[PDB]
Amino acid sequence: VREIVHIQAGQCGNQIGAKFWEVISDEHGIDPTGSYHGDSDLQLERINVYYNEATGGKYVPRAILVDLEPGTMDSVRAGQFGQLFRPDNFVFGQSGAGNNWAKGYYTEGQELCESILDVIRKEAESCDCLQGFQLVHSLGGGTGAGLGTLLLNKLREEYPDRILSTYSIVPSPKVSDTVVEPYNCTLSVHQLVESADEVFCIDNEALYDICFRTLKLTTPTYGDLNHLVSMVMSGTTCALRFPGQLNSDLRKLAVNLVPFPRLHFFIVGFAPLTSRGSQQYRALTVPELTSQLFDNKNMMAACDPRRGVYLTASAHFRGRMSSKEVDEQMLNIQARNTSYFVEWIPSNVKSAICDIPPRGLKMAATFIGNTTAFRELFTRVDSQFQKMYARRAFIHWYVNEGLETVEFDEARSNMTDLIQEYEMYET
Amino acid sequence: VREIVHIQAGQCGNQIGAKFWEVISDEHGIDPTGSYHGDSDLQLERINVYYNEATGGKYVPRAILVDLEPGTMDSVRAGQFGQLFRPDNFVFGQSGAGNNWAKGYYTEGQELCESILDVIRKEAESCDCLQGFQLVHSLGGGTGAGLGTLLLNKLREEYPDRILSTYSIVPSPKVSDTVVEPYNCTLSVHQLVESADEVFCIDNEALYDICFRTLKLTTPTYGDLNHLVSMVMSGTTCALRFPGQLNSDLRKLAVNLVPFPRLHFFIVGFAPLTSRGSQQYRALTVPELTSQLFDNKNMMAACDPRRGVYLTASAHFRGRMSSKEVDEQMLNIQARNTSYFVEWIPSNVKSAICDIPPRGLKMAATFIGNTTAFRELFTRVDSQFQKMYARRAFIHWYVNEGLETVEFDEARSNMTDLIQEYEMYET
Amino acid sequence: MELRQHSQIEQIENAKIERRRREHAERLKRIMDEKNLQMGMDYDALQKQIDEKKA
Amino acid sequence: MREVISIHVGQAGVQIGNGCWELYCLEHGIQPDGQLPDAFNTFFSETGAGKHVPRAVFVDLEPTVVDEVRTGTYRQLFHPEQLISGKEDAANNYARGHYTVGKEIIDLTLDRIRKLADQCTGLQGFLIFHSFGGGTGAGFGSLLLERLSVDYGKKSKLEFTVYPSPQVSTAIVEPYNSILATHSMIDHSDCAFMVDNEALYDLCRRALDIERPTYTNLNRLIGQVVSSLTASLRFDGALNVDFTEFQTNLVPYARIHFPICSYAPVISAEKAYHEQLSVAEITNSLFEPANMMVKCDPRHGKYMACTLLYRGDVVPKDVSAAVATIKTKRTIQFVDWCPTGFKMGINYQPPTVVPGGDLAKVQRAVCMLANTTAIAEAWSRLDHKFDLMYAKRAFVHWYVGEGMEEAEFPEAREDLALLEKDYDEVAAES
Amino acid sequence: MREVISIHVGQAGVQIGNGCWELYCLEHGIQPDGQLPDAFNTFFSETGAGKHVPRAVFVDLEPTVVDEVRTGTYRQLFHPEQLISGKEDAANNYARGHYTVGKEIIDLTLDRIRKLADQCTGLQGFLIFHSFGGGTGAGFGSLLLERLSVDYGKKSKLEFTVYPSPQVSTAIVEPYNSILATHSMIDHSDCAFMVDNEALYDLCRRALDIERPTYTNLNRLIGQVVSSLTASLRFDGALNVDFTEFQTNLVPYARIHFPICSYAPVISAEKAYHEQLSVAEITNSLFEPANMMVKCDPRHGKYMACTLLYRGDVVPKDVSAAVATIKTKRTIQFVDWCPTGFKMGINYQPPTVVPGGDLAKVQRAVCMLANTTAIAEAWSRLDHKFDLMYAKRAFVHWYVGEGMEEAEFPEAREDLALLEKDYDEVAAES
Ligand SMILES: Nc1nc2c(ncn2[C@@H]2O[C@H](COP(=O)(O)OP(=O)(O)OP(=O)(O)O)[C@@H](O)[C@H]2O)c(=O)[nH]1
Ligand SMILES: Nc1nc2c(ncn2[C@@H]2O[C@H](COP(=O)(O)OP(=O)(O)OP(=O)(O)O)[C@@H](O)[C@H]2O)c(=O)[nH]1
Ligand SMILES: Nc1nc2c(ncn2[C@@H]2O[C@H](COP(=O)(O)OP(=O)(O)O)[C@@H](O)[C@H]2O)c(=O)[nH]1
Ligand SMILES: Nc1nc2c(ncn2[C@@H]2O[C@H](COP(=O)(O)OP(=O)(O)O)[C@@H](O)[C@H]2O)c(=O)[nH]1
Ligand SMILES: [Mg+2]
Ligand SMILES: [Mg+2]
């Protein structure tokens, strides 16, 4: 009884979130019509974490979907599992997104803000207990980036104690789908640092790299990319839903990995990812997972850990496995790569074991780590933003909405200070 | 044995009452021909409250129909349940309504009033006991607004002890169907404040908003709006007709809800309402009814409770349910939202339970509240009256009936004093 | 204006939902055939144009 | 039950009336002979057996126009006492049709209308048709009204008069007659509607695609409004408007009673195949200067209270949406007082057409009668025409010779001046 | 639902439009009568029964071009009100089309466009077509745009106009009209696309295999571009781009809005059978100077943000691979302050071929609009031709006689000069 409320914003959030419920529904065993047709009693133990039950044996997810234009919504209901969601949690506007952060924050955000909060209030106050919320959005756009940050303040004001876990997609370095991304990403960062507890950062380029290097997919689509992200979201909350030999929920993760309030940005990775031809050669052992997780290529964010130093690391294991073997690997990897860890924190690796694995896989692992390599990703957007801002640019589109030019300077100042903060703690 | 006399005056009142008898007759199981064909012995326990029995098993309602022109009387005569009423109870004039308050109150009202009062007298004196009266009328018209006040003063003169509960519809804030309503409503307010014990205000606009938002009805005719309002009349007096764990009649409600002699205007609501096809997504329980009742959108009057504060509130519950569940819910909603309730009145929420819910629902609820938010509505009509009165304008049509200009100033003076009295008690 | 709209509209949206699932499925088939994706052409109906230009 | 009396005077009034009774009799299902092959009683009396007789009186001081009806198809419909004809017309002279010739037949006429009012138990108004330029339309129209005021007092008297057009004119002495009749209408009439031929002519070319209309096509357009106006007394509906409700809503004062009219949709058959004609479009087309039946521009002034009358499958819900949409038009000016500004009527019987007609058969239609200050523009035109003639005494000898005293000519100018003052006084800032 | 309105001004506007509406009706599957043998709402309305009607208004000051539609096969599709024809054209005179003859018809047109916008619940923009050298295209287009700006305010007014060719010319007074219209469009138009006949003429000979084209072949090319741009609103896709997204991403400042056009593949049927036309191939073909629809080479200038539209079975991976390769090409320049520089869209619905058409039925295609400083080359050429004629005052008497004040000739010259200064300062880098 540690319920979690799920919020999806924008095109990125709705498609990632829709694929997310396909994963969980099959894990728990819920038919797409919403009825339980499962195979084990353990599934119905703690389905209350994510679902409400409609009288009749029909289970409804705790999902709230937000967008400024209804185009993406009807694409979700056209999906196989779209009938599952409650029709009244569909909250959408009747205006173009604009791909504009200021337009989403000031003009269309305020109109939708009041309606969304009450929809949040229904699901937040319908359960016996509430641990935290779960936000899925991208930062390069205007809808999820703009309105997502505004809702993040209101959630913090009303519900300070609860865990505001957010998952973010960062604009890519090489090829990106929007010109004005440096403006959108820089402004959004100010709200994430002060409001949310936990932030996980995903880069689209690394998702492509994993597909071509490891999975050997000849033609990857956005379905395959979004499938990888859903696994990490599934893994983190698995400790809530199933029994295990060593439990670790969200609040344990925040306490251990976060040493200071502002340093809470994370990278993730998932093992085992097996090539379709290498399956016959790979013998699944616990050390085999350890190799994939700490390998730099497996990281879902295009920031190389070797260029920085680790502060904390966390690994989650799923399946029945030896406790000695898991604990020995954390010692082994820590002691054999000592140059990448900070001296003034001993035992930088946290570990956990959960008993029930994903379907088809007899053992799997999840990795969450915090490192100084993030200075790379923020320096990237800062450089592009400066040149786009030294001369004025598309900026007039934002000024005509109500945003003041001083907000950009404040946006860069806070973003710059977080870069220096990670510089200091490397020493 | 707590009989109640029902009077229908004007177009709006007549059609609401016509639907209102369909609700009762189905709930008791009386054939449209006036004969009993029901299914439970409990229906015949206390049918005497609303009906008279004609020798032969034919049941006749205690209804009196009033209008100034015969148009609506013929409309009811052709209705499905038209034959139910007693033909001698149809009293009407032979002149146009005129949409004039002064004309209805002074010119045509006096000749009709002496006959109407005697029509009341046969039914009021025919029964073993008589607790109160029931009137349905509008407050923007010429017949209901004017003649309803005239009969209310006379009924108070003859029956001082009885509860003169009336049901009124207020002119809408955005779009309304008459040019000269502000004159009509202002003049009627003087009478209702001093003579009627209980007044329930309902707005047509909130009825439409409930229709789209919850009922999804694309084209709501006047049948749906009157049926929704008919639910509230049926809910309030249900405690007299059926047994329950905690009885609460009209006088119990007056003493509880009304703290001072002049603050007795009420806002009403009902739950649950069925979203087409979406009812399969909803698990109806006692906590779910509580969510709708204190949801501000389900209020039938277009005055926002959140902009004011509450003084007293009352909820009825119908069906076999837990008494602990009811009493815990009232406490929960009062403790979680302390800002909207007054300190110098503790336990602002009254509760009650009835055993037999209406047909079609295994449980249902009724909400009645009294709040300072009525100041929004009375400011509306006072403002339109003020800028119309300064120019004089349409007064030309009321003066030629015998109404002095001094009555307009007196009517505003009492109306404004009522607004101030709500202002002062907010402290 | 006047209609039972929601009872009609539900059928309209249900038909649209089924419509998109069909074109999603048949698109998926012709995508997975990577010759048609990277390289393919409609070589039959394209030829019909050439004889028209001869005519 | 409830009854309305229709009186037709002069050539213009009776020629419109022939078209009106065709429209009514066809709508109720009565053959032109008065037999059948409800609302019937609002316009007709049932003689017995199965025969019906209208409530109408036809009067003109010359027999040509009335004899057309006496010889035409409708000869079997009327009661011959109703068809009243003089000997020689007024020669487009006010003084002749009021003082010298008009008095031969006034007392005969007043007996017939009063005799017709006895059979009518629940009367609520009159319907009178005029043309201002004519001697019989104005001179005899003024004389008839003056008596009906004292004869009946507090019964609403509603008029339908053709105001002289800006440029189109068929009589040279037309401005003289209009001002003399202007005094009589303002005091006695309860409410008088304005129409003019020039706007009707332009209306029946653009909307109805007619190359070259006649007086016949115009008369069917006017009859639709009267049928639309009185449909609330005849048919069922969600919202009913009586004559008195009309009277209180439209007029804020005593001398400001003159409205102007509009109708929608007026469309041809082959255009109706392209257009939806839902309640939004029909209400939006009402407010265009193109559709107004008086060639005066509403944007030159402001609006007082307006009344809308709907005919068809119209639900109370989106008529509110239509009115809300109209209030957003910044090209539409409303006066600060009377912020409500509307009364709406919904009745369910669709419009009726006529064989060989001009109007397409439509799901629903809307009729608009509104009160605006733009009609002072119509008075200013007529005033300027009068002053040029009377400066040099262009035609006074004809009117003086027929009994008229000259002192009336400046007095009638004085009264029209006061009326122009009253409208600008009300139209001024609050 | 979401709506776009098209207005077609002048001979060029009408001739382009009837080709465009042929493309759309065949694309959606509507017979010329409007019947059927979805996204219909974006361009059409449902009249009832089963008949549709376009959202278009055709305007010209002479009847010959419009009457061709009235007697053509498509006469049944259009509402007769939509086709507006004047009495006598502007004779390639801007003053005649702006002051004298233009104001005779302006208010008739503005009613019909406004009335059509009532039917558009979710209106998001207009499309307007011109030919700059024509009197009505330049003169009446300026008056239409200026009025439309204040009437509707913040609504996207997108234009699709034909630039005078650098050497091909059919009017001697052609430079005079273009510069005068340049002032009116710069402040009122939200974004205006540029094409010229000479570049199109060269394209339909080389890429498409036609020895001797006509205006029909060029206009069918333009319809493909409009079809691809609007396809994001109509049909499903993996990456949608609304009108507002185009407006924000392309233009860095209010004054620099002019894009240029490109489309690929444009290939004949037999050569289309010869090759295979992958995503990388079509993206490469967009950036060659030969494919540009305006006869100005981008290599003299630099690129600001460019927008890509992909139609067919194109997968988001193959797009990213192609655009990155283009960034590596050192024959393509980008100003330093646009490192991102791109906006991409993917849509699933292939283009539609036409009976008697010229282009191949390919299964994957791309459309391109880019903002470049090379367009300043076109501005300089028009400026030089104008100076030679105006120095000796070669044609002033015609414009002055038709109401134009002479002082407007130097003002329009300076406004164009100011526009050329803005591009040079933007082209610089720091
Ligand atoms: N709308 C309409 N107007 C008509 C018709 N017939 C005549 N008129 C108008 O009547 C106006 C003049 O009134 P008169 O024709 O003189 O009619 P009158 O009142 O009988 O005057 P006298 O014939 O001289 O006695 C002209 O301006 C016409 O426009 C008609 O059939 N329809
Ligand atoms: N691309 C293209 N251009 C055209 C076409 N027809 C005319 N033009 C161009 O239009 C210009 C001549 O002006 P018009 O087409 O007559 O435009 P207009 O506004 O109607 O000018 P007026 O006839 O004086 O009213 C020439 O420069 C042509 O190049 C066409 O079908 N396609
Ligand atoms: N990983 C991933 N990225 C996506 C998906 N769909 C869109 N994107 C990317 O997300 C970025 C921002 O999307 P956008 O439409 O602006 O989202 P919004 O503005 O918040 O509604 C774009 O560059 C897209 O390419 C998806 O399904 N998965
Ligand atoms: N709820 C409801 N309201 C109505 C109905 N009919 C009319 N009204 C409203 O009642 C208001 C005044 O009614 P009115 O006709 O003046 O009643 P009267 O006083 O008897 O003449 C109008 O604004 C109508 O909108 C109905 O059937 N139901
Ligand atoms: Mg005559
Ligand atoms: Mg032309």
Side-chain angles (χ1 to χ4, degrees), chain B residues 206-207 210-211 215 217 223-233 270 273 300:
Chain B
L207 296 179
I210 286 165
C211 284
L215 290 176
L217 310 185
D224 318 73
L225 279 80
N226 298 355
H227 171 267
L228 290 183
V229 178
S230 79
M231 291 295 78
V232 180
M233 271 146 278
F270 178 87
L273 300 179
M300 261 147 197

PDB file of all heavy atoms in Angstrom, chain B residues 206-207 210-211 215 217 223-233 270 273 300:
ATOM      1  N   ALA B 206     -25.893  26.173 -14.449  1.00  0.00           N
ATOM      2  CA  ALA B 206     -25.225  25.054 -13.793  1.00  0.00           C
ATOM      3  C   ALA B 206     -25.842  23.730 -14.218  1.00  0.00           C
ATOM      4  O   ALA B 206     -25.150  22.708 -14.296  1.00  0.00           O
ATOM      5  CB  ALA B 206     -25.284  25.219 -12.275  1.00  0.00           C
ATOM      6  N   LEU B 207     -27.147  23.729 -14.498  1.00  0.00           N
ATOM      7  CA  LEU B 207     -27.794  22.520 -14.987  1.00  0.00           C
ATOM      8  C   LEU B 207     -27.228  22.101 -16.340  1.00  0.00           C
ATOM      9  O   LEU B 207     -26.970  20.914 -16.570  1.00  0.00           O
ATOM     10  CB  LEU B 207     -29.306  22.735 -15.065  1.00  0.00           C
ATOM     11  CG  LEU B 207     -30.028  22.977 -13.736  1.00  0.00           C
ATOM     12  CD1 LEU B 207     -31.517  23.204 -13.943  1.00  0.00           C
ATOM     13  CD2 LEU B 207     -29.803  21.825 -12.785  1.00  0.00           C
ATOM     14  N   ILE B 210     -23.600  20.764 -15.766  1.00  0.00           N
ATOM     15  CA  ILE B 210     -23.646  19.391 -15.272  1.00  0.00           C
ATOM     16  C   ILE B 210     -23.955  18.434 -16.415  1.00  0.00           C
ATOM     17  O   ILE B 210     -23.454  17.304 -16.455  1.00  0.00           O
ATOM     18  CB  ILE B 210     -24.669  19.277 -14.123  1.00  0.00           C
ATOM     19  CG1 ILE B 210     -24.110  19.927 -12.860  1.00  0.00           C
ATOM     20  CG2 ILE B 210     -25.025  17.831 -13.836  1.00  0.00           C
ATOM     21  CD1 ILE B 210     -25.152  20.188 -11.799  1.00  0.00           C
ATOM     22  N   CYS B 211     -24.793  18.868 -17.358  1.00  0.00           N
ATOM     23  CA  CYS B 211     -25.213  17.991 -18.444  1.00  0.00           C
ATOM     24  C   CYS B 211     -24.046  17.624 -19.356  1.00  0.00           C
ATOM     25  O   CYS B 211     -23.831  16.445 -19.660  1.00  0.00           O
ATOM     26  CB  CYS B 211     -26.353  18.646 -19.223  1.00  0.00           C
ATOM     27  SG  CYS B 211     -27.945  18.580 -18.363  1.00  0.00           S
ATOM     28  N   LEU B 215     -22.975  14.267 -17.505  1.00  0.00           N
ATOM     29  CA  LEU B 215     -23.929  13.446 -18.238  1.00  0.00           C
ATOM     30  C   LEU B 215     -23.599  13.324 -19.720  1.00  0.00           C
ATOM     31  O   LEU B 215     -24.159  12.450 -20.390  1.00  0.00           O
ATOM     32  CB  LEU B 215     -25.343  14.007 -18.073  1.00  0.00           C
ATOM     33  CG  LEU B 215     -25.995  13.883 -16.696  1.00  0.00           C
ATOM     34  CD1 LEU B 215     -27.354  14.566 -16.678  1.00  0.00           C
ATOM     35  CD2 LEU B 215     -26.118  12.425 -16.305  1.00  0.00           C
ATOM     36  N   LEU B 217     -24.639  14.782 -22.126  1.00  0.00           N
ATOM     37  CA  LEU B 217     -25.792  14.948 -23.002  1.00  0.00           C
ATOM     38  C   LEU B 217     -25.543  16.058 -24.014  1.00  0.00           C
ATOM     39  O   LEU B 217     -25.416  17.227 -23.642  1.00  0.00           O
ATOM     40  CB  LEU B 217     -27.051  15.244 -22.190  1.00  0.00           C
ATOM     41  CG  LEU B 217     -27.353  14.306 -21.024  1.00  0.00           C
ATOM     42  CD1 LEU B 217     -28.686  14.658 -20.393  1.00  0.00           C
ATOM     43  CD2 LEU B 217     -27.335  12.850 -21.470  1.00  0.00           C
ATOM     44  N   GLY B 223     -36.553  18.405 -20.350  1.00  0.00           N
ATOM     45  CA  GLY B 223     -36.863  17.199 -19.603  1.00  0.00           C
ATOM     46  C   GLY B 223     -35.738  16.775 -18.679  1.00  0.00           C
ATOM     47  O   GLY B 223     -35.977  16.398 -17.529  1.00  0.00           O
ATOM     48  N   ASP B 224     -34.497  16.815 -19.173  1.00  0.00           N
ATOM     49  CA  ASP B 224     -33.363  16.400 -18.353  1.00  0.00           C
ATOM     50  C   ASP B 224     -33.148  17.349 -17.184  1.00  0.00           C
ATOM     51  O   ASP B 224     -32.935  16.906 -16.048  1.00  0.00           O
ATOM     52  CB  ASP B 224     -32.097  16.323 -19.203  1.00  0.00           C
ATOM     53  CG  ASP B 224     -32.344  15.701 -20.555  1.00  0.00           C
ATOM     54  OD1 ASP B 224     -32.962  16.373 -21.406  1.00  0.00           O
ATOM     55  OD2 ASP B 224     -31.918  14.547 -20.767  1.00  0.00           O
ATOM     56  N   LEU B 225     -33.203  18.657 -17.442  1.00  0.00           N
ATOM     57  CA  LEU B 225     -32.976  19.642 -16.389  1.00  0.00           C
ATOM     58  C   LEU B 225     -34.019  19.515 -15.287  1.00  0.00           C
ATOM     59  O   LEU B 225     -33.691  19.549 -14.097  1.00  0.00           O
ATOM     60  CB  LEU B 225     -32.988  21.051 -16.982  1.00  0.00           C
ATOM     61  CG  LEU B 225     -31.709  21.542 -17.659  1.00  0.00           C
ATOM     62  CD1 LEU B 225     -31.578  20.991 -19.065  1.00  0.00           C
ATOM     63  CD2 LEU B 225     -31.691  23.060 -17.683  1.00  0.00           C
ATOM     64  N   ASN B 226     -35.288  19.365 -15.668  1.00  0.00           N
ATOM     65  CA  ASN B 226     -36.338  19.210 -14.670  1.00  0.00           C
ATOM     66  C   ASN B 226     -36.211  17.891 -13.920  1.00  0.00           C
ATOM     67  O   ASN B 226     -36.509  17.833 -12.722  1.00  0.00           O
ATOM     68  CB  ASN B 226     -37.708  19.318 -15.335  1.00  0.00           C
ATOM     69  CG  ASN B 226     -37.929  20.665 -15.979  1.00  0.00           C
ATOM     70  OD1 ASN B 226     -37.097  21.563 -15.856  1.00  0.00           O
ATOM     71  ND2 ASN B 226     -39.049  20.814 -16.676  1.00  0.00           N
ATOM     72  N   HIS B 227     -35.779  16.826 -14.600  1.00  0.00           N
ATOM     73  CA  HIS B 227     -35.580  15.554 -13.915  1.00  0.00           C
ATOM     74  C   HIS B 227     -34.469  15.650 -12.879  1.00  0.00           C
ATOM     75  O   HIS B 227     -34.587  15.094 -11.781  1.00  0.00           O
ATOM     76  CB  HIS B 227     -35.272  14.443 -14.918  1.00  0.00           C
ATOM     77  CG  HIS B 227     -34.842  13.162 -14.275  1.00  0.00           C
ATOM     78  ND1 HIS B 227     -33.519  12.850 -14.051  1.00  0.00           N
ATOM     79  CD2 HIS B 227     -35.560  12.111 -13.813  1.00  0.00           C
ATOM     80  CE1 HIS B 227     -33.440  11.661 -13.483  1.00  0.00           C
ATOM     81  NE2 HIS B 227     -34.664  11.193 -13.323  1.00  0.00           N
ATOM     82  N   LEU B 228     -33.371  16.337 -13.214  1.00  0.00           N
ATOM     83  CA  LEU B 228     -32.292  16.510 -12.247  1.00  0.00           C
ATOM     84  C   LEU B 228     -32.778  17.275 -11.028  1.00  0.00           C
ATOM     85  O   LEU B 228     -32.473  16.909  -9.887  1.00  0.00           O
ATOM     86  CB  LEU B 228     -31.114  17.241 -12.889  1.00  0.00           C
ATOM     87  CG  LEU B 228     -30.284  16.523 -13.954  1.00  0.00           C
ATOM     88  CD1 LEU B 228     -29.131  17.404 -14.404  1.00  0.00           C
ATOM     89  CD2 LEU B 228     -29.768  15.185 -13.450  1.00  0.00           C
ATOM     90  N   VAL B 229     -33.546  18.339 -11.252  1.00  0.00           N
ATOM     91  CA  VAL B 229     -34.100  19.092 -10.140  1.00  0.00           C
ATOM     92  C   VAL B 229     -35.119  18.252  -9.384  1.00  0.00           C
ATOM     93  O   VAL B 229     -35.225  18.349  -8.155  1.00  0.00           O
ATOM     94  CB  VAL B 229     -34.691  20.412 -10.662  1.00  0.00           C
ATOM     95  CG1 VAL B 229     -35.318  21.198  -9.548  1.00  0.00           C
ATOM     96  CG2 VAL B 229     -33.600  21.233 -11.326  1.00  0.00           C
ATOM     97  N   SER B 230     -35.871  17.403 -10.089  1.00  0.00           N
ATOM     98  CA  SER B 230     -36.866  16.573  -9.420  1.00  0.00           C
ATOM     99  C   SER B 230     -36.224  15.590  -8.449  1.00  0.00           C
ATOM    100  O   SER B 230     -36.863  15.183  -7.471  1.00  0.00           O
ATOM    101  CB  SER B 230     -37.714  15.831 -10.453  1.00  0.00           C
ATOM    102  OG  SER B 230     -37.030  14.706 -10.974  1.00  0.00           O
ATOM    103  N   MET B 231     -34.970  15.201  -8.692  1.00  0.00           N
ATOM    104  CA  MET B 231     -34.281  14.304  -7.769  1.00  0.00           C
ATOM    105  C   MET B 231     -34.160  14.928  -6.386  1.00  0.00           C
ATOM    106  O   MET B 231     -34.297  14.238  -5.368  1.00  0.00           O
ATOM    107  CB  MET B 231     -32.896  13.951  -8.312  1.00  0.00           C
ATOM    108  CG  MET B 231     -32.845  13.069  -9.573  1.00  0.00           C
ATOM    109  SD  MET B 231     -33.465  11.371  -9.484  1.00  0.00           S
ATOM    110  CE  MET B 231     -35.238  11.592  -9.564  1.00  0.00           C
ATOM    111  N   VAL B 232     -33.897  16.235  -6.331  1.00  0.00           N
ATOM    112  CA  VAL B 232     -33.648  16.901  -5.056  1.00  0.00           C
ATOM    113  C   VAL B 232     -34.923  16.984  -4.223  1.00  0.00           C
ATOM    114  O   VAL B 232     -34.894  16.755  -3.010  1.00  0.00           O
ATOM    115  CB  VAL B 232     -33.029  18.286  -5.304  1.00  0.00           C
ATOM    116  CG1 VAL B 232     -32.755  18.988  -3.991  1.00  0.00           C
ATOM    117  CG2 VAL B 232     -31.749  18.142  -6.114  1.00  0.00           C
ATOM    118  N   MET B 233     -36.059  17.311  -4.849  1.00  0.00           N
ATOM    119  CA  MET B 233     -37.315  17.286  -4.105  1.00  0.00           C
ATOM    120  C   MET B 233     -37.608  15.893  -3.565  1.00  0.00           C
ATOM    121  O   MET B 233     -38.027  15.742  -2.412  1.00  0.00           O
ATOM    122  CB  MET B 233     -38.486  17.770  -4.962  1.00  0.00           C
ATOM    123  CG  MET B 233     -38.739  19.267  -4.914  1.00  0.00           C
ATOM    124  SD  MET B 233     -39.329  19.973  -6.461  1.00  0.00           S
ATOM    125  CE  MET B 233     -37.792  20.188  -7.332  1.00  0.00           C
ATOM    126  N   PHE B 270     -26.864  16.617  -6.055  1.00  0.00           N
ATOM    127  CA  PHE B 270     -27.240  15.211  -6.051  1.00  0.00           C
ATOM    128  C   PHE B 270     -26.073  14.365  -6.541  1.00  0.00           C
ATOM    129  O   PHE B 270     -25.222  14.831  -7.303  1.00  0.00           O
ATOM    130  CB  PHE B 270     -28.484  14.961  -6.922  1.00  0.00           C
ATOM    131  CG  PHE B 270     -28.900  13.515  -6.995  1.00  0.00           C
ATOM    132  CD1 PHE B 270     -29.749  12.974  -6.043  1.00  0.00           C
ATOM    133  CD2 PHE B 270     -28.452  12.703  -8.025  1.00  0.00           C
ATOM    134  CE1 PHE B 270     -30.129  11.647  -6.112  1.00  0.00           C
ATOM    135  CE2 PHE B 270     -28.826  11.378  -8.095  1.00  0.00           C
ATOM    136  CZ  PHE B 270     -29.667  10.850  -7.139  1.00  0.00           C
ATOM    137  N   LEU B 273     -24.239  10.517 -10.592  1.00  0.00           N
ATOM    138  CA  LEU B 273     -24.733  10.699 -11.947  1.00  0.00           C
ATOM    139  C   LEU B 273     -23.922   9.822 -12.891  1.00  0.00           C
ATOM    140  O   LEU B 273     -22.724   9.604 -12.687  1.00  0.00           O
ATOM    141  CB  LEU B 273     -24.657  12.168 -12.374  1.00  0.00           C
ATOM    142  CG  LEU B 273     -25.453  13.148 -11.508  1.00  0.00           C
ATOM    143  CD1 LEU B 273     -25.289  14.571 -12.009  1.00  0.00           C
ATOM    144  CD2 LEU B 273     -26.918  12.760 -11.460  1.00  0.00           C
ATOM    145  N   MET B 300     -25.744  22.671  -8.125  1.00  0.00           N
ATOM    146  CA  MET B 300     -26.746  23.072  -9.104  1.00  0.00           C
ATOM    147  C   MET B 300     -26.905  24.583  -9.225  1.00  0.00           C
ATOM    148  O   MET B 300     -27.700  25.037 -10.054  1.00  0.00           O
ATOM    149  CB  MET B 300     -28.098  22.438  -8.767  1.00  0.00           C
ATOM    150  CG  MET B 300     -28.405  21.190  -9.582  1.00  0.00           C
ATOM    151  SD  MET B 300     -29.366  19.962  -8.684  1.00  0.00           S
ATOM    152  CE  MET B 300     -29.080  18.513  -9.688  1.00  0.00           C
TER     153      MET B 300
END
